[PDB]
Structures are given as C-alpha cells and as structure tokens.
Design a protein around this ligand. Structure first.
Ligand code: RFV
Lengths: 539, 531, 530
C-alpha cells in the first residue's frame, strides 16, 4: 500500500556549487537616440554622428522609421519586414575610414532567424495586408513606427565585443532603397505622387557605455563582402581572399524584363498555402462563370465552354468537375478552359492554368449575384503564384496568354521586394543542381545535393538557410577566428563559384525568369586602436 | 579529404564536486481577508542545495449548469506572491505578475501551467450533474535566480530551514464564467491543492562562497496617477515600467471571449460573432425582444442602410417571402452629450452577407467586412450602460446579455486583452532630481524585447550587461548626500477621446526595480542590501 | 584601488590549427534479410569528425490506391546506428532513441521529411499515375560528438571508423489502403543512403581521454507493468515510457490526418470519415449498410434519442421525395449483451448542414461532438473482434475500403499523439531500495523544462554537470549490497472492458544512459611472419 520515501538512494575537485564573483570594469550603460542628416546624393542617405567624451563603447544599433499616413484611392500594402527592405546599405566609419559595413540584403539574411527583430521591422496585418482606398481622402494606411535591429559583430558577446571609441568620432551612414521596393500597389494607386511626397524619417538608437579606466585590447572582426554575377551567368568570383571565415552562395530572380506585376499577393499571411489560396481566389471569378448565355467581356482567344449535365468538362486529357448549386433557370454554368496559357510553338506542349483544376464546387447567391465557392481540388503550386504577368504574354508565347477579364487584370499588383531569392516568393524551389567552389585553380568543395544548406540550417538552427561553407568552428570573440588562408605564389587568393542550374521545359513561363548568382564572403580584419579606431585586412 | 595554441579539439575532463541530484515533492500547509497561503518547509541533513522550483496544482472537476473556462496559463494566474525565506528572513521573493513576466518567453513553462482547449475554451453545462471541466493537473515553473547557472547558482542551505510560501489569488481571478454558472457555490467548494517540487542536491564537502542576488521590488501608482516613486534605490540592476487596467468601477463583465484561441483576430472574431445575431435579423415584421431605444431599420432593395455618414451593405440569401431583413443601427452606442459625437458599434460594419437556414431558423453569416478592433472587445459592458452615457447604450437582446462573461484575469496590461495599444506617449525617469532617462517612442521596450528574446516585453532600463553568477552585477549607484537615492517615474498618457467608452477604463502605473543584495552563509542563509 | 576583470576586452587566444570539410560517402548495402548500410572512414588528413547526416533517396511511387509517408520518414527508416573501430563499438543507438534525442530539434525533424508532399495521403487513379514524386530526405544522426563542436568531436587516432546503419522494413514508414499494391512496392523498394559528416584536418592534435554516455534500451513483456535494466554501474539518466503493441490487429485504422498533425487534425479527419455514413439524405430507408445497422429517420424536432444521448440533426435544402436519416450505431462495442455499450454515434450531439442538389451530397456546416484522440487511435480489428457481442463495424463498404494501414515504429502511449497518460504511478528501484517514486509525471515536466522540449518522457537525470568539460555525475552501483540494477514498476490506469482501447496491448520501455571512458590506446606490437 505505502512506499519508501528516501532521498539519494544511489550515492582534486572543481567547485560546481560556487564561483568567485569577479568584480567587473566599472561602467554605466545608456540608451541613446539620435536624429540624422538626410541627403539625396538622388538616393536617400541618413548620417548619424556619435562624438562624446563619456561614450566609451557602443553596440545594439536600432534604426527607427516613421511610416507616414497613406491617403487616396487604390490598393496599397507594405512588403513583410518593411524596415529591413528599406535598407540598401549600412556603413560604420571613423576618422581612419570604414570600421564595418553591410549590404541591406545581408543584414536581413543575418537577422532572418531572429523572430523578434523581424516583428519589430514591420510584420502585421495593419502594414502587410493589401488595403483599399475608396475616395481621394480615404486613409489606406495609418502612420506607424518600425524598428530595424542593425545586427553588428559588436553584439556577439555584449560588452566584450562592443565597439570602442578611442577619442574618435563614429559615423553611422544608412543608404535607403527607393520607396517602390517596399510597397505593393495596383495601377489605381497614385504612386507618382506617393513617390514625390514620401520621405524617409529615421532615428538611430544604440546602447552606449560610460566606462571608467577602459583597458582596450586589439580584436578581430568579420566583414561581409557580396559579389553578384551577371544575368543568367552561373559563375561569380571573389578576388583577394586571404583570410575568410565563411562563404555563402544563393540565387536571386531578375525581373527587369517584366513590368514587375503579379496576379495575386496574400498580404500578411505568408505561408506557401496562403500564396496558393490568394492566387486560386483571384482566378476563380473568371474560371467558373454563371451567365445568361455565353459570358461577355473576355478576349476572342478565350475558350469558355458550357458545363455539361454530368459536370465534367474535358480540356484535352484533363477533366474538370464543375458543380454550382442554386443556378437560376435562365442561367448556365461556364468554364474558362484557357484562363492563362503558354506555348512556344502552335503544336508544342501548352502550360494551361485551367488544366491545374480538377474539381470546383459552390453555390450561386441570388442576393449578391455571385458564386460562393465551397471546395476546390487543384494542383496550383508556389511557382504559379510567382510568375510575373509579363511572362504570360512574352514574345516566346504563340498564344495571347492572358485570357482574364479586364476587371481581374486591373487587380494585378506591382511587387518590387529587393530581397527575393530563387524563382518563387517562398524560395521553396531549389534550382541549383550542382555547386563547385574553387580556391585559385583547385577545387575546394563540390556538391550534387544541398548538403551545405542542410549543415547551414542545422548549425545555425534556421529554416531559411543558404549553401554555406563554414571555416570557423572556434568560439567567437574569445578566440582568433579560424580561416581559409591564401597562397599568393600558388595563385590561391580568390574564391570562384560555379553552379549548374536545374532544367525545365521551355513551355513553362517560369523558365524565362532571369537569375543572378550571389556570393557572400566573410573576410577577417584586425581591429586596432593606436590613433583612433582602424581596421586592417588579415593577409 | 581534398606560437602557443589553445587546444580546441580536447579538454581535461575536470572532476566535479561529488553530488547526487533528486526530484523532491512536498505537500504544504494551507492557511487563510481569508487569502489561501501554502507553506513548504525544506530541511534535510542530506539536501545541501536546491533549484528549479515547480508548483503543481490539482484543478477539480467542475459540475453544474452554465458557461465556464479557465484563463490561459491558469497556473501562473493562481499565484499572488512567492516567498523564499530562512531563519534570518526573506532570501528571495516575487509578485505573481513578475514571475509570469519572467516566464512569458518560455513556451514550455507556459504550456505546463495550463494552456489547452480542454482548460481555456468556455465549456457549457446543460444539467446540474453535467461535467463542465474534467479534473486536471497544472505545473508552474517558479523561475528563481538559482536556475541561471544550474548547480553554480543553486540555493545553498547552511543547515538552515528554508520556507517556500505561496500566496494564492482568489479563484475568481483564474475563472471566466457567465451568470448562469453557480460561482457562489464553486467559490465556497474550491480549494487550492498545491505540491512543491524542486531539484535537491546532496553535496559531499560543499565549498560555499559569497554570492549576489537581484530581488524584484514592485511599486503600484495611485489609480490614474501618471507618477510612481521607488525609494531607497542604492544598487539597482534594472527598472521596468508598464500600465495595468483597473476594472473596480465595473462588474468585470465583457460581451465576448475567444477561449483557447488567443490571437488579436480571435478576440475580434469572437466579438463580431456575438454581435451578428442581434445586428442582422430575419423577421416576420419588425423584430421583437429589443429595448425601446433600439433603432432596427428594414434593409432596402439596394442592400444599403445609412447610419449618418456610414453605409452598411446587408444581403441575406434564402429569406422567406413572409419575412424581411432588418439591421440594428445602434446595437451599442456611447455619448457624453446629446446631438454630439456618438461611438456606435453598428457603424463599425460595412458589409454583412449570409444565408438564412429554414431548418434551424437562423442566419448563417458568410463574409463580414468591418473595422472592429481589439479595444472594442476589451470594453467592459458596464461602460456602455454607465452614468456618463446619455444613451441606453446596450440595445442587445436579453439572450445576448445573458451570454456575457466575467473576466477577472490579474495579469492584463495596457487597456486591451492583448496589450496591443501603447498608451504611454512619453516616459521620464529621474534618479533624485536629475533626469536619468527620457523617451517618446517605446525604444526601451524594443531593447527589452531584443535582449530578452520576448515578443511581450516592457519599457525596461537595464544597468547590468555583465554575465550573471560569474561576475558581481553592474548597478546604478546612489549618492545619498546629493539626494540621488530614489527612482521617480513620470508618464504622459495618450488619450482616446472622452466619447470613447475605453477612456473610462482606469489605469495603474507599475514600476518594478531590481535591487542588488549580497548572499552570505555565516550562521544560516542571509541577504544584505548593497548600499 | 580594487582589482577588476576586463569586461570590455579579451585576449584573442590562438586556437589549434585546423580546416573543416563536408565529406559525403556512399555505402555498401547488405541483406531476416534486413537492409544494412556500412560506411568506412579512413584518411591521413581527417583527424576528427562530427555532425553525421544520412541522406535517403525516396523513389517515385506509381500505381493505384492511397499512399503516404509517416511524418519524419527519415528517422522512422532507422532501426539502429552503430559507430565502431577495430577495438569494437564506440557508440550505438536504437532508431527510436535517436528520434527521441532529436524530437526537440525542429530543423532536423523538417529535414527528415515533414511536408504535405510526403505526408499527405496521395491517391493513384490509374496503374501509371504518379502517387509520390522522387525526393531526398536528410537525417541528422545526433551523437555525443556534437555537444561542444570541435572539443567533443570523434578523434580517429589513425584508425578506421565504421558507421553501420540498419534499416526498418519499408512497411513501417508507409501509410496505405488495400488498393495500393504494397506486395510489389516492398519487392521493388531499395534504401539508397549516403553519409555526410564534418571532417577536421588538424595540425599537431593533442588528444586527451574523455567520457561518453551510451544509451541502452529494455522493452518489457506484453501488458507487464514491470521492466529491469541489469548491470547498472554508472548511469547519467533513466527514461520511462510506454509503447502500444498492435500484433493482435491487422494495423488498420479508419482515418489519418496526413501532414496536419495536431490533436484536432486527427479528430477532424476521423469525424469527416464518419459523417458520410452518420447522416444520410435518402429516398426511403438507406441501402448498402449491414442488417445490424439501426438507421433511424430524423423526426420533425430534429432530435434522435440513442438511450440517454440526444442527437440534434438539421439539414437544409432536403428534396421533398427524400428524408434525413441518422445511423444510431455506426461503431459499437460491448463484451456482455446487457452491460455498457461504447457507441460512436452517441459521441455526437449536433449535426447541421445543407444538401447539394448538384453533387447529391450533404455539405456539413457545424458538428458538436465529444470525439477524442483515443477514438482516432482505435484499430479497426478491435471493433470486429471476438470479444464483441455486437457486429461492431456498421459502416458502408465504401468507408471500410478507405481504411489505412499504419505501422509507424515510434508510436508511444495508447494514442497517435501520446496524449493519454496511462501511468498512474511510477516506482524506480536501485536494487531493493526505492530510488524514486511519483504519481503524476513531474519527471516528464522536469525533462520538458530542462531540455526545452514539448514531447518529453518521464526522465530521472543524475547529471547536472556541464558536459565535455567535466566528468559526468552518475548513480553508482554497490554489487555487494545488490544495488547494480534498475527495476521499474508502473501502475497502469484502469479502463472499461466495454471500451475498445482496453484491448490495445502495452509495452513498458526503459532507457538507461551508461557512462563509458573513451581512451586512445597507443603501443608497440610484434607479429611473427607466417
Ligand atoms: C561549459 O563551458 C565552460 C567551460 C569550462 O571549461 C574550461 C576548462 O574550458 C573553458 C573554455 C574552453 C573557455 O573558452 C572559457 C572561456 O570562454 C572563459 C572562461 C572559462 O571558464 C572558460 C573555460 C574553462 O573554465 N572566458 C573568460 O575568462 C572571459 C574573458 C569571459 C567570461 C565570461 C563569462 C563568465 C562566461 O561567458 C560564462 C557565462 C560561461 O559561458 C563560462 C564560465 C562557461 O561555464 C559555464 C558553466 O557555462 C565555460 C566556458
């Protein structure tokens, strides 16, 4: 009935129950906020000068942005993580030059695993859903403040890693992307006026440290260097590589051959399913039509077929089951059999979006004169939602391409997000089949599968990683970083990247998305404090 | 395959202090303002050190009629105060809200405390013998400074009796219920059944050293007063400032509650759903059962009903020929003066679509286009029918009013259930007469959230960026001669107009200060304030 | 005046000179005819290694029938992993323990195969139709060498390291209906593995002795509430959990949610599978159901009474020539004719919907029910078992044909989510002495908090000392006093004989982590030439 209740029935040394509480350097932290100086030398540049006899060291840079009230007519929304997308380049410099600098996309890539930093930058239904303005005085977006955590190497080990000011003046320079990049809008929205009236209103905050009798020592800093290859060039080279801690490789789409218009956008909801659902919903109004006689308002190239008694409409080998309840006696159910279609020859394989549907059910509403769709069985993927509208009507297409109504075409959105990777909005599709990295003429690393991305994701505990070669497994700040080292005499002083892209059919519109290869190299530098703060490249 | 150096591929495996851990569970002693207090005495010649306190709570079976559910994270909400003391006095103590604030970034601890559809959805009892809630056990992780560096930070018992005292909040605070639920009986029959668990360490030849502890001190400002002061500040590691609503001027009743689903959208959807039954009515002639002050207008053929400048589009399918569609144009209305601004909830709707069901004699709503916000869902029912209001205010059916819920959660912040609305426009902190810190925007909250990796932080000034346990914490230090020995906080509140019911939600300013103490083990365990 | 430690600067220590490399190797396949992959690691430049990742090429699946992979397919493929040298095994693990060790690692679980593409149950309509496209999954083989990166890495002291992976039969990793030609799939399926690791080329490595925790598993007898781990001398931890045993069944279940794995998803998938047979809109009494079925016409008030249980059924747009019917005994179980009856139809209180004239189907709107996770976890075999006095399964032949074979090897408890805690009391003895006892799972709570996991097990941790840098703290044996074994005794929760889940057989699982010393033997040896 009862049981024995006894404790620990299984029982030069280092003390694990006590430690000597070390007295630290005497200091005082302070959250300091500064207004900048705006310049259009006509790209927007904000400059922040930090010069104080009491600020001995600093870290944890946060940039505030006052987003204005948006008024007028049309559809408008901000890209997710708007604050990060605003950033083109961040530079930290002293009297001796640049101490540390980064491209906007690399800063974003460095913070992509930090949920809190991403939320602060602007990720909400209020900002990211596509809002509509009905009158010229209607408020589309209310004023808002976003916060961008400018992650720097000075944050790694808090005070130990902090940037020390050796009686030197520090300047933080932020270069901004055009407002076109951070905004999703329809043609109805007056962007011309918005672009003229929009001003970047920034404020820089940092944690400053007032230190008594600071004992400065030399340190090491990893400075990222980005190299972008030519359009559709599967190579890129990083020259003068002497001491690198890591190398990252990824693809970016190039939409210069398009008007940057897309059929749909999910808004705040960013899952793969949300992108697909938003796209399906945009097509359904033109796909299944309840009309009195053949539907009007569609191009002559459109092939709208009346749905038979059994509900099955055949588009070649593809069968589409369409069944709508409460259809008026004077009306019939019609299926648009070629809503979007692409073909390079008149008798080639045809990519038809209408063939990607297998079952469509719903109920017609007499009160609203609309079909309310219940269940949709389809094979629409993330690539479909990522096809620019221009690619459906490119010269390579022998067909009209876009057989949608003028109403649907007017609802198309301009998406100019500067940090898109791969060939889709989610970077789901891996389009690199093979990766080869050369240090000089010698093959340093090669792979036929994304094992370097698997390791990057595993080691960094992230789900949005890249093909990365890490040379440094040594703890940061407390140790001098381990690096791949050059041999100038043998010609091993450069990193050459070569990729082999995955293949596709010529009759798929996404085949024509132009790609650029991006190579990121982290070079090791020495931080010295002789005559103010200065950095020296390790060679 | 394709200079003095520190070894990074090998280490000398140090032999640690000889010890044995044990998970120890203890029943307490219950005491009763008649507030429930549980006392747990820890003393054993073999328990040398302890940490990782976990309090278990046996939630009973809930039977009877009416609507009932538990607040999310029920276990944390149960806690009013936790005290850890020896023969020499309090070693460490915390207010229930501060413990919860300290664990808010720990998903596992929050889940263990009681966060499930079984506990947090509002269940209904149909008969006096019907089970509303099944019995359940919740676990509250009592985070203490002794957990930071595991064995290194652990509380050492120097042959002294350690007492863990847990003060409980009244059961009213942890429960969400309607008027039909017999709370009077539940409150009389409810007993807190706690059990304290901890990781005990039997240590052979322990070498105790002096240490430091940060003890939180809380100051609550006078109701609606935008100032609070913390006296005798000599060595503080941090200072936190936040606002709480005070519902003493109300019956603590709210129209809706989302249950287990806790997103901002879930709160809004639950509210919209509760209003829709009285908002759009399919009736044979003018609808009955509504107050005289109700302005229920028949929807015209174009579907548009105008409430001043606001147009509401109403379209219901399958409406019987003998019936018509009606719109309640003043479901909830507020104004301090007649022929002036009106806060009308019916005006917060732009489009309502649905289909009438002949089988259930109800409208099944399809799509709703509205501007209902989190503040609307956070308005107590009492503020709609208050004396300040020139209107009747609550023009809902008796059926809807009967579905209202009592919400007494003790850890609500700001003026809404999600703490979404920032009501602090300016914060000023003074150390003596000198301005230590001032801000407009909540940059101190942004830093708190970044540095503590939490999405629900507070306006916090951190003075200590030194690693804990291994170093003596960095503090803001007093100057008694210069009068710099107190922290004075002044806030400037942003306001929603006087014709907004939420203006009448009273505010409490909360100031939390972490004072540094020395921990010595000379004749028992004792703490000394650093001065 | 006071001596202060510098918190604004540090002396950047120069580390051991090394170079890392991601190395991938193909194995050697062997064939109880269980698949075994062997990977030999021997190099003059590879000094140390860690972070083992196994790749698996999943083939294209063609044909007819319903087919899907279990969530985290890659981990479920693994029966056993062994890392050995010329001196024997260095470290080894059972597949379930590897999975249990990685269950708190979201990234590793995602890489192993967790997607709608893999885990939703796909349907093949023609013998040439593609059910699943080819895919590659990655299994992170977590080892003690990963804890402190380079410091913890496996040092291969001029020896040949062999990584041996034993695979589970493909039946375990696949969910399929009767229509799916499993016989052919099983014959044609081949495990195609590749091992990757992070290798380190180290200049002048200074190897030191270390410690390793090796997991050991003991599975108790079917339905026995006891298990014993013998020869326990230095253990760092002990875990206790339960596994169901489905040997007495055909491993068939009514429903499966696919990729969506929440408790609600399992319940919703089950409710959806039953609704077509539960509420029927028919012209006269419904046909195609067994004679034992009691399908009652729904009255004007909408209330149908099944003993004390009232079911409210209201369907809109029902044709005038048709009526609404309720299957009052869809699934029923009882051991004695006049005793308790477990009836799934009684677990419903309200069903609303609208009949579709276009598709000749009822589209259900709102369902008020008390269906739980246990209901979704009942094998179909128990409803039609010999113990049952009733027919049991009164569903249509259409519904019965949609049943799925689920053979996942890592199921714990008595339900798919391991939600039901069937252990009322736990007692652990070290020899004759009670080492630990608990009623509620406070040891699971501590495991979940300390390891930051939401799917922990009742675990007793003896080591709170930092790993690698310190020799682990252990529970130590006393052979003379008989304290050299860990005996686990549980008190199982009591369930009703008229409840089908009562007949799900249970096995008690006990995991022990034994401490081992890792040494590097160097010496001169002579051999006579022969
Ligand atoms: C489990 O790891 C332990 C290994 C012990 O083994 C030993 C034998 O090997 C190391 C290794 C490989 C290191 O590089 C250490 C290092 O960086 C130190 C301090 C140590 O003690 C280190 C130790 C040894 O003691 N640095 C410093 O002197 C400076 C300039 C700053 C320190 C700041 C704070 C105090 C820490 O950051 C602290 C929050 C915590 O991280 C450590 C104290 C940690 O202890 C614990 C319990 O976590 C160590 C690293």
């Amino acid at each position: 009935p009862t049981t024995e209740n006894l404790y620990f029935q299984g029982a030069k040394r280092s003390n694990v129950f006590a430690v000597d509480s070390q007295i630290p350097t005497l200091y005082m932290p302070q959250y300091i906020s500064l207004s900048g100086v705006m310049t259009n030398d006509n790209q927007a540049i904000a400059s922040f000068e930090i010069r104080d006899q009491y600020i001995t060291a600093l870290n944890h840079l946060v940039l505030s942005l006052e987003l204005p009230e948006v008024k007028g007519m049309g559809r408008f929304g901000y890209v997710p993580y708007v604050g990060y997308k605003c950033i083109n380049h961040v530079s930290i410099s002293s009297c001796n030059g640049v101490i540390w600098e980064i491209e906007g996309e690399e800063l974003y890539n460095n913070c992509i695993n930090n949920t809190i930093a991403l939320k602060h930058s602007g990720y909400s239904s209020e900002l990211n859903d596509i809002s509509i303005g009905l009158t010229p005085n209607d408020t589309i977006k209310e004023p808002s403040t976003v916060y961008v955590y400018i992650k720097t190497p000075f944050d790694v080990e808090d005070t130990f890693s902090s940037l020390k000011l050796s009686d030197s003046k520090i300047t933080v320079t932020v270069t901004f992307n055009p407002v076109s990049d951070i905004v999703i809008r329809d043609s109805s929205f007056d962007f011309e006026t918005f672009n003229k009236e929009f001003v970047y209103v920034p404020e820089l905050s940092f944690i400053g440290y007032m230190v008594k009798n600071v004992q400065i020592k030399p340190s090491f800093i990893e400075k990222p260097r980005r190299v972008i290859g030519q359009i559709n060039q599967p190579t890129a080279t990083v020259t003068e590589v002497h001491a690198a801690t890591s190398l990252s490789v990824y693809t970016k789409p190039y939409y210069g051959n398009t008007d940057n218009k897309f059929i749909s956008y999910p808004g705040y909801s960013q899952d793969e399913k949300d992108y697909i659902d938003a796209y399906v919903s945009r097509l359904l109004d033109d796909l299944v039509i309840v009309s009195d006689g053949p539907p009007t308002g569609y191009p002559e190239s459109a092939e709208i077929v009346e749905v038979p008694e059994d509900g099955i409409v055949s588009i070649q080998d593809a069968d589409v089951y369409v069944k709508i309840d409460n259809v008026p006696d004077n009306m019939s159910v019609y299926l648009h059999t070629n809503l979007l279609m692409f073909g390079t020859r008149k008798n080639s394989f045809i990519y038809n979006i209408s063939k990607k549907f297998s079952a469509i059910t719903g109920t017609y509403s007499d009160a609203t004169k609309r079909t309310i769709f219940a269940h949709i069985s389809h094979s629409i993927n993330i690539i479909d939602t990522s096809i620019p509208v221009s690619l459906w009507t490119s010269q390579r297409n022998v067909y009209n391409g876009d057989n949608r109504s003028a109403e649907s075409k007017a609802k198309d959105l301009f998406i100019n997000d500067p940090f898109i990777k791969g060939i889709d909005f989610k970077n789901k599709t891996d389009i690199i089949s093979r990766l080869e990295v050369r240090f000089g003429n010698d093959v340093l690393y090669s792979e036929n599968g994304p094992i370097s991305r698997i390791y990057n994701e595993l080691l960094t505990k992230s789900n949005n990683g890249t093909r990365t070669l890490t040379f440094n497994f040594t703890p940061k700040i407390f140790f001098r970083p381990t690096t791949i080292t050059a041999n100038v005499s043998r010609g091993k002083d450069k990193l050459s990247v070569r990729v082999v892209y995955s293949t596709m059919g010529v009759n798929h519109p996404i085949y024509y998305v132009q790609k650029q290869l991006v190579v990121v190299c982290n070079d090791l530098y020495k931080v010295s404090y002789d005559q103010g703060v200065s950095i020296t490249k390790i060679m």
